[PDB]
Amino acid sequence: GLYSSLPPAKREEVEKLLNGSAGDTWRHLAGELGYQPEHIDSFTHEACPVRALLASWATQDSATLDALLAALRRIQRADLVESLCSESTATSPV
Amino acid sequence: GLYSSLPPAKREEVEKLLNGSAGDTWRHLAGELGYQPEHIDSFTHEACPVRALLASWATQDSATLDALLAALRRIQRADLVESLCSESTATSPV
């Protein structure tokens, strides 16, 4: 299940979670994904580093939800896993 | 002078620079200011960590432009010193 296959309403909830609860888990994700520190600096160029990270990660087949969930586990952010499953409920594709 | 003594239009320009050009420089500042690593994570709870940093800095007498400039020099961001001084000639309080 590629992250790029999700509807825009699901991607907006990933932004809302880091905008409203804890905008800092993406640093830990980039660490366990093994991103070089120059990419972490390229993501902090914007106030929403999550939007740039998700768009940049979606360029490659590694962008599976299975890999995202494994990295979330390695950083002890199973709370974000639980929230993203509960917030998966939606109403339209657009 | 104290950063807390500036008009709100100047504080909006410090936010707009980190929101729109590059939002990394507050991390480098927090390092040379000698902040604890828990404060860095507490600021990144929000999308605009600069708004929370500037608020938690304005509550102490350490918030002088003289200290801000010394930190900006140590982090090799004298380009930002020029940009912020070049916007100081505003005439638009709120």
Swiss-Prot record, chains A, B:
Residue span, Death domain: 11-88
Residue spans, topological domain Cytoplasmic: 1-94
Domain of life: Eukaryota
Compartments (UniProt record): Cell membrane; Cytoplasm; Perikaryon; Cell projection, Growth cone
PTM characteristics: N- and O-glycosylated. O-linked glycans consist of Gal(1-3)GalNAc core elongated by 1 or 2 NeuNAc.
Domain remark text: The death domain mediates interaction with RANBP9. It also mediates interaction with ARHGDIA and RIPK2. The extracellular domain is responsible for interaction with NTRK1.
Role this protein plays: Low affinity receptor which can bind to NGF, BDNF, NTF3, and NTF4. Forms a heterodimeric receptor with SORCS2 that binds the precursor forms of NGF, BDNF and NTF3 with high affinity, and has much lower affinity for mature NGF and BDNF. Plays an important role in differentiation and survival of specific neuronal populations during development. Can mediate cell survival as well as cell death of neural cells. Plays a role in the inactivation of RHOA.
Self-association state and partner proteins as the record states: Homodimer; disulfide-linked. Heterodimer with SORCS2. The extracellular domains of the heterodimer bind NGF. The cytoplasmic region of the heterodimer binds TRIO. NGF binding mediates dissociation of TRIO from the receptor complex. Interacts with RTN4R. Interacts with TRAF2, TRAF4, TRAF6, PTPN13 and RANBP9. Interacts through TRAF6 with SQSTM1 which bridges NGFR to NTRK1. Interacts with BEX1. Interacts with BEX3. Interacts with KIDINS220 and NTRK1. Can form a ternary complex with NTRK1 and KIDINS220 and this complex is affected by the expression levels of KIDINS220.
Protein known as: Tumor necrosis factor receptor superfamily member 16
Gene it is expressed from: NGFR
